[PDB]
Design an enzyme around this catalytic site. Structure first.
Site, mmCIF file in Angstrom:
data_model
loop_
_atom_site.group_PDB
_atom_site.id
_atom_site.type_symbol
_atom_site.label_atom_id
_atom_site.label_comp_id
_atom_site.label_asym_id
_atom_site.label_seq_id
_atom_site.Cartn_x
_atom_site.Cartn_y
_atom_site.Cartn_z
ATOM 1 N N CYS A 107 0.888 -1.416 -0.017
ATOM 2 C CA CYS A 107 -0.141 0.218 -0.041
ATOM 3 C C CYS A 107 0.888 1.265 -0.084
ATOM 4 C CB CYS A 107 -0.835 0.028 1.317
ATOM 5 S SG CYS A 107 -1.978 1.404 1.293
ATOM 6 N N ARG A 110 -0.068 4.585 2.890
ATOM 7 C CA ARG A 110 -0.072 4.548 4.292
ATOM 8 C C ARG A 110 0.200 5.592 5.166
ATOM 9 N NH1 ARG A 110 3.587 -0.603 4.934
ATOM 10 N NH2 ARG A 110 4.372 -0.192 2.880
ATOM 11 N N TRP A 279 -9.309 5.971 -1.216
ATOM 12 C CA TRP A 279 -9.570 6.812 -2.669
ATOM 13 C C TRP A 279 -8.531 6.341 -3.427
ATOM 14 C CZ3 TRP A 279 -8.907 9.586 1.698
ATOM 15 C CH2 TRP A 279 -7.445 10.227 1.974
ATOM 16 N N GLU A 284 -3.690 3.798 -10.825
ATOM 17 C CA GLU A 284 -4.478 2.607 -10.749
ATOM 18 C C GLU A 284 -5.490 2.512 -11.892
ATOM 19 O OE1 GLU A 284 -5.540 0.973 -6.737
ATOM 20 O OE2 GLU A 284 -5.400 3.205 -6.324
HETATM 21 C C1 HEM Z 1 -6.481 6.570 1.330
HETATM 22 C C2 HEM Z 1 -6.104 6.345 0.231
HETATM 23 C C3 HEM Z 1 -5.536 5.047 -0.188
HETATM 24 C C4 HEM Z 1 -4.616 5.000 -1.487
HETATM 25 C C5 HEM Z 1 -4.327 6.032 -2.379
HETATM 26 C C6 HEM Z 1 -4.123 3.742 -1.387
HETATM 27 C C7 HEM Z 1 -3.256 3.195 -2.464
HETATM 28 C C8 HEM Z 1 -3.160 1.773 -2.678
HETATM 29 C C9 HEM Z 1 -2.451 1.365 -3.950
HETATM 30 C C10 HEM Z 1 -2.351 2.241 -5.505
HETATM 31 C C11 HEM Z 1 -2.404 0.156 -3.829
HETATM 32 C C12 HEM Z 1 -1.932 -1.004 -4.828
HETATM 33 C C13 HEM Z 1 -3.101 -1.514 -5.467
HETATM 34 C C14 HEM Z 1 -2.837 -2.314 -6.633
HETATM 35 O O1 HEM Z 1 -2.037 -1.833 -7.392
HETATM 36 O O2 HEM Z 1 -3.798 -3.396 -7.014
HETATM 37 C C15 HEM Z 1 -2.703 -0.339 -2.493
HETATM 38 C C16 HEM Z 1 -2.493 -1.657 -1.847
HETATM 39 C C17 HEM Z 1 -3.135 -1.991 -0.689
HETATM 40 N N1 HEM Z 1 -4.027 -1.150 0.205
HETATM 41 FE FE1 HEM Z 1 -3.935 1.109 0.098
HETATM 42 N N2 HEM Z 1 -4.588 3.142 -0.673
HETATM 43 C C18 HEM Z 1 -5.381 3.839 0.332
HETATM 44 C C19 HEM Z 1 -6.000 3.383 1.478
HETATM 45 C C20 HEM Z 1 -5.873 2.054 1.919
HETATM 46 C C21 HEM Z 1 -6.998 1.677 3.267
HETATM 47 C C22 HEM Z 1 -7.959 2.541 3.952
HETATM 48 C C23 HEM Z 1 -6.639 0.319 3.398
HETATM 49 C C24 HEM Z 1 -7.195 -0.660 4.587
HETATM 50 C C25 HEM Z 1 -7.644 -0.061 5.680
HETATM 51 C C26 HEM Z 1 -5.424 0.002 2.489
HETATM 52 C C27 HEM Z 1 -5.045 -1.236 2.357
HETATM 53 C C28 HEM Z 1 -4.289 -1.886 1.146
HETATM 54 C C29 HEM Z 1 -4.094 -3.194 1.034
HETATM 55 C C30 HEM Z 1 -4.051 -4.470 1.967
HETATM 56 C C31 HEM Z 1 -3.314 -3.175 -0.004
HETATM 57 C C32 HEM Z 1 -2.584 -4.375 -0.703
HETATM 58 C C33 HEM Z 1 -3.626 -5.338 -1.733
HETATM 59 C C34 HEM Z 1 -3.132 -6.324 -2.106
HETATM 60 O O3 HEM Z 1 -2.011 -6.941 -1.828
HETATM 61 O O4 HEM Z 1 -3.696 -6.726 -3.192
HETATM 62 N N3 HEM Z 1 -5.293 1.021 1.600
HETATM 63 N N4 HEM Z 1 -3.167 0.856 -1.849
HETATM 64 N N1 LIG Z 2 -7.836 -11.809 -9.158
HETATM 65 C C1 LIG Z 2 -6.828 -12.231 -9.745
HETATM 66 N N2 LIG Z 2 -5.924 -11.659 -9.805
HETATM 67 C C2 LIG Z 2 -5.671 -10.520 -9.047
HETATM 68 C C3 LIG Z 2 -4.905 -10.753 -8.011
HETATM 69 C C4 LIG Z 2 -4.755 -9.428 -7.244
HETATM 70 C C5 LIG Z 2 -5.109 -7.954 -7.870
HETATM 71 C C6 LIG Z 2 -4.910 -6.691 -7.023
HETATM 72 C C7 LIG Z 2 -6.145 -6.243 -6.425
HETATM 73 N N3 LIG Z 2 -6.035 -5.170 -5.696
HETATM 74 C C8 LIG Z 2 -7.137 -4.332 -5.617
HETATM 75 C C9 LIG Z 2 -6.716 -3.226 -4.731
HETATM 76 C C10 LIG Z 2 -6.320 -3.455 -3.449
HETATM 77 C C11 LIG Z 2 -5.882 -2.398 -2.629
HETATM 78 C C12 LIG Z 2 -6.009 -1.321 -3.019
HETATM 79 C C13 LIG Z 2 -6.609 -0.704 -4.334
HETATM 80 N N4 LIG Z 2 -6.360 0.597 -4.496
HETATM 81 C C14 LIG Z 2 -6.868 1.573 -3.700
HETATM 82 N N5 LIG Z 2 -6.656 2.615 -3.880
HETATM 83 C C15 LIG Z 2 -7.741 1.094 -2.549
HETATM 84 C C16 LIG Z 2 -8.645 0.205 -2.130
HETATM 85 N N6 LIG Z 2 -9.349 0.323 -1.077
HETATM 86 C C17 LIG Z 2 -8.913 1.120 -0.231
HETATM 87 S S1 LIG Z 2 -7.775 2.157 -1.346
HETATM 88 C C18 LIG Z 2 -7.029 -1.741 -5.163
HETATM 89 C C19 LIG Z 2 -5.806 -8.197 -8.968
HETATM 90 C C20 LIG Z 2 -6.179 -9.347 -9.578
HETATM 91 C C21 LIG Z 2 -7.123 -13.596 -10.271
HETATM 92 C C22 LIG Z 2 -6.321 -14.800 -10.430
HETATM 93 N N7 LIG Z 2 -7.310 -16.066 -11.079
HETATM 94 C C23 LIG Z 2 -8.341 -15.692 -11.389
HETATM 95 S S2 LIG Z 2 -8.838 -13.934 -10.744
HETATM 96 CL CL LIG Z 3 -9.117 -0.975 -8.908
#
Ligand code: HEM
Ligand SMILES: N=C(Nc1ccc(CCNCc2cccc(NC(=N)c3cncs3)c2)cc1)c1cncs1
Ligand SMILES: [Cl-]
Ligand code: HEM
Ligand SMILES: N=C(Nc1ccc(CCNCc2cccc(NC(=N)c3cncs3)c2)cc1)c1cncs1
Ligand SMILES: C[C@H](O)[C@H](O)[C@H]1CNc2nc(N)[nH]c(=O)c2N1
Ligand SMILES: C[C@H](O)[C@H](O)[C@H]1CNc2nc(N)[nH]c(=O)c2N1
Ligand SMILES: [Ca+2]
Ligand SMILES: [Ca+2]
Ligand SMILES: [Cl-]
Ligand SMILES: [Gd]
Ligand SMILES: [Gd]
Ligand SMILES: [Zn+2]
EC number: 1.14.13.39
Lengths: 403, 403
Positions: A107, A110, A279, A284
């Site tokens: 993330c 953070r 947000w 993204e």
């Molecule tokens: C407040 C604005 C926030 C922004 C701009 C932000 C931004 C991002 C971005 C760009 C990613 C990479 C996601 C991707 O490329 O698929 C990410 C991952 C992640 N964020 Fe944040 N985030 C925010 C808030 C939060 C909040 C509120 C939480 C939880 C309380 C959170 C938890 C996570 C987690 C767990 C991941 C990793 C997801 C994964 O491994 O697939 N984020 N965030």
């Molecule tokens: N799903 C599959 N792969 C797959 C694995 C991982 C992923 C990555 C998905 N992260 C979605 C995500 C996670 C955390 C932050 C954001 N963005 C934000 N800014 C926020 C969201 N909340 C608060 S902020 C978006 C995408 C696809 C599959 C594999 N085989 C069948 S499906």
């Molecule tokens: Cl998305």
């Protein structure tokens, strides 16, 4: 203690927190697997995680070893001896939700970790109550475009009982329809969930941007299909400041990123339904969701409209088209008064987060591959920053799909 | 064996070659250090490395287990027993240099690994002969702009005699004049070697693109200064196809990237001087060398001349300026008829390499953070390719600076 250097400034720090890493990642001295998306794959054990989370909590509020500390410990001991699980205090849950965000290595956002609204849905039963907890989350978090970070925690997993699950990977997703010509209309990422909504009796649309219903699942029941009220789903039509034809492409995206398929782990407890939202960072949407070859894959369409030379790579037509799509995203969200952060601002803030955490706890787990933005990598400061990746608890974790 | 996924296509492979990784890297199950720039830092150990390498050579020629194979193993065994070391056959040196390239995890150019011209300089006896070998390398490799990959291998390390070393990090490098106030005229990356050239008698210029002399070190000798003949150093003036003022920035870069400070290790033998050269990928010049804040740092200057709103990050002025600088580099090399490859063509050829190596050897050591280019990352196919990083031998290794 690993030594970590910033190659732009030359500064040196030591990550002492990594010595505390709870669980084991996929890497060994023989081979590094840091680029893999999935690093893969009872009561005496539950108690050990529960105790150490409690020690974390009381240490964070200075009450290290004090009167309340020992009583909370003996409380959890008796609860688990009686029921096989235990209940968190409401402040422990807030603390645990924030620390799990704080600990998420992938993330970049953070710097905001201390500001999160926790909605306690642990008394929930039935999918219609889920849907109402969810609709209140969306309305609070959207806030008419002034987005606010929030998480809604549904009841934990416990023995012999089914699970609360949200089948959708996000609260807002566009449908993806397989078609005779082989490809997909809409978002190809969502082809699986789209045919599941259709299986469970949802009449589909035929647009590239049809918002999906929710498939919510209460313990030991089939999932029920709910439609989100369209006035609850804020969307941004995409236009470009100077390319008047961009609007005619009909692109849009939704305001609120609300991830609904990860599992929250606090003190050995596991919450398989705990959707969180914040947000978006502009890349993204404008780089990954619109320009990934396996997503909307629009980049050549824009380049044609910009009259670029698409027959040689060395004209950098791909690079020029991506920039203008990202410009369109930033411009459209700002014009609609929806919170968005560009990748330069976000990475600059993450650098400040790294400095804050170096002083707070001696390091910060960070995943370089996911922190560095998907465009303009080396134009951001995080590119030049060495990072250490490791797993701390409380945490957000991947989990098998329900089906 | 680790499972490896391509997320653009869905395809899955297993890297069975990683199970053969000899030397250990810096990661553990507790913490991944994959993003660190420097991951690291007698008869029977030499033999096991020599035996392995000989086995590799005889597999490469489809003659494993032959009479020649067994006899060469015995022959190496006898020489090590008699002298504590051994000598490679000429054919082995050629094979080992190509295998070192093939094994280099940070090189995106490895589709070319079989086309490498190997100059054998192991009879070199002085710094003066060293300079002649180096001039012959540059002349062959430059080939008046039709660049050809080459390596010259100077004598191996041996007991009781100093190493051959080239002190310069590359054969062609621009002077960096460190200023009193911490500023730099020229290339900031080369401030150390610039001050050593001056201390060793070089009369310095005062330009931004002053080609440095070579400090060449024969065994047990102070380094000696040699000036490269200007007619051997092909350079490219930078201009932009549509921004005519760009030429007035007075930028230039050199044709031939020729790394001269890495150690080549083959069958347990070490070659501290073994310069190698190929051609550039345009992002190395246009993005890292010219736009890194700690290099020529020209991004703001260009954006200003392009009339971009440099007062707000969300204008994406940095991204737009970096694209046009990269366009200028490619246009300028193509106009000069000097070999160059853009990051899209390079990464597409690297995906072909991975498929080749999966078939040939069951895997390929690859450093994701170095293979993905510093701009437009997710617009290239390698961003979406999971990679396994590990150390095979023969190998190119870092080594301490000789001063
Ligand atoms: C407040 C604005 C926030 C922004 C701009 C932000 C931004 C991002 C971005 C760009 C990613 C990479 C996601 C991707 O490329 O698929 C990410 C991952 C992640 N964020 Fe944040 N985030 C925010 C808030 C939060 C909040 C509120 C939480 C939880 C309380 C959170 C938890 C996570 C987690 C767990 C991941 C990793 C997801 C994964 O491994 O697939 N984020 N965030
Ligand atoms: N799903 C599959 N792969 C797959 C694995 C991982 C992923 C990555 C998905 N992260 C979605 C995500 C996670 C955390 C932050 C954001 N963005 C934000 N800014 C926020 C969201 N909340 C608060 S902020 C978006 C995408 C696809 C599959 C594999 N085989 C069948 S499906
Ligand atoms: Cl998305
Ligand atoms: C033929 C065209 C070639 C291209 C386009 C190319 C491209 C590259 C690039 C872009 C890098 C990253 C460099 C950096 O960021 O500093 C790299 C690294 C590397 N290349 Fe290649 N290369 C080529 C040929 C060669 C040859 C002929 C050799 C050796 C015989 C070689 C060996 C290496 C090694 C060992 C590294 C890793 C350097 C390090 O770890 O610092 N490459 N290459
Ligand atoms: N500067 C320091 N660290 C440092 C460490 C590592 C590095 C990375 C150096 N890559 C230079 C390089 C390597 C391989 C390929 C190319 N490019 C090509 N296309 C070709 C070259 N040959 C055939 S193809 C360029 C740079 C700096 C210091 C440490 N202590 C005081 S300074
Ligand atoms: C193979 C690689 O791990 C995968 O494509 C990762 C790379 N870095 C990423 N970075 C972000 N922010 N989001 C992603 O989905 C990915 N995907
Ligand atoms: C900290 C980080 O490892 C460092 O900046 C790396 C990242 N990836 C890189 N990739 C390439 N090709 N070249 C580099 O110099 C670097 N630098
Ligand atoms: Ca045209
Ligand atoms: Ca001999
Ligand atoms: Cl270079
Ligand atoms: Gd037109
Ligand atoms: Gd012009
Ligand atoms: Zn690792």
């Amino acid at each position: 203690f690993p030594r970590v250097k910033n190659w732009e400034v030359g500064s040196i720090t030591y990550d002492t927190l990594s010595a505390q890493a709870q669980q084991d990642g996929p890497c060994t001295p023989r081979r590094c697997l840091g680029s893999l998306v999935f690093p893969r794959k009872a009561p005496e054990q539950l108690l050990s995680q529960a105790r150490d989370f409690i020690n974390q909590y009381y240490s964070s509020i200075k009450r290290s070893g004090s009167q309340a500390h020992e009583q909370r410990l003996q409380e959890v001991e008796a609860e688990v001896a009686a029921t096989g699980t235990y209940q968190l205090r409401e402040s422990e849950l807030v603390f645990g939700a924030k620390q799990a965000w704080r600990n998420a290595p992938r993330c970049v956002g953070r710097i905001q970790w201390g500001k999160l609204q926790v909605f306690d849905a642990r008394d929930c039963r039935s999918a219609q109550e889920m849907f109402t907890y969810i609709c209140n989350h969306i309305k609070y978090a959207t806030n008419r475009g002034n987005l606010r970070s929030a998480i809604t925690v549904f009841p934990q997993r416990c023995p012999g009982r089914g699970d609360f699950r949200i089948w959708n990977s996000q609260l807002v997703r566009y449908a993806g329809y397989r078609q005779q010509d082989g490809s997909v209309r809409g978002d190809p990422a969502n082809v699986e969930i789209t045919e599941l909504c259709i299986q469970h009796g949802w009449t589909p649309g035929n647009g590239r941007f049809d918002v999906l219903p929710l498939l919510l699942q209460a313990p030991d029941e089939p999932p029920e299909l709910f439609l989100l009220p369209p006035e609850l789903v804020l969307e941004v039509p995409l236009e470009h400041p100077t390319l008047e034809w961009f609007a005619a492409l009909g692109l849009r995206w939704y305001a609120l990123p609300a991830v609904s398929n990860m599992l929250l782990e606090i003190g050995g407890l596991e919450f398989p339904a705990a959707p969180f939202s914040g947000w978006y960072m502009s890349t993204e949407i404008g780089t990954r969701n619109l320009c990934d070859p396996h997503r909307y894959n629009i980049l050549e369409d824009v380049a044609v409209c910009m009259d670029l030379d698409t027959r040689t790579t060395s004209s950098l037509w791909k690079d020029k088209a991506a920039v203008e799509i990202n410009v369109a995203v930033l411009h459209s969200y700002q014009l609609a008064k929806v919170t968005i952060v560009d990748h330069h601002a976000a990475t600059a803030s993450f650098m400040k987060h790294l400095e804050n955490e170096q002083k707070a706890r001696g390091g910060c787990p960070a995943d370089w591959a996911w922190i560095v933005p998907p465009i303009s990598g080396s134009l951001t400061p995080v590119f030049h920053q060495e990072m250490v990746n490791y797993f701390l608890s409380p945490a957000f974790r991947y989990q098998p799909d329900p089906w």
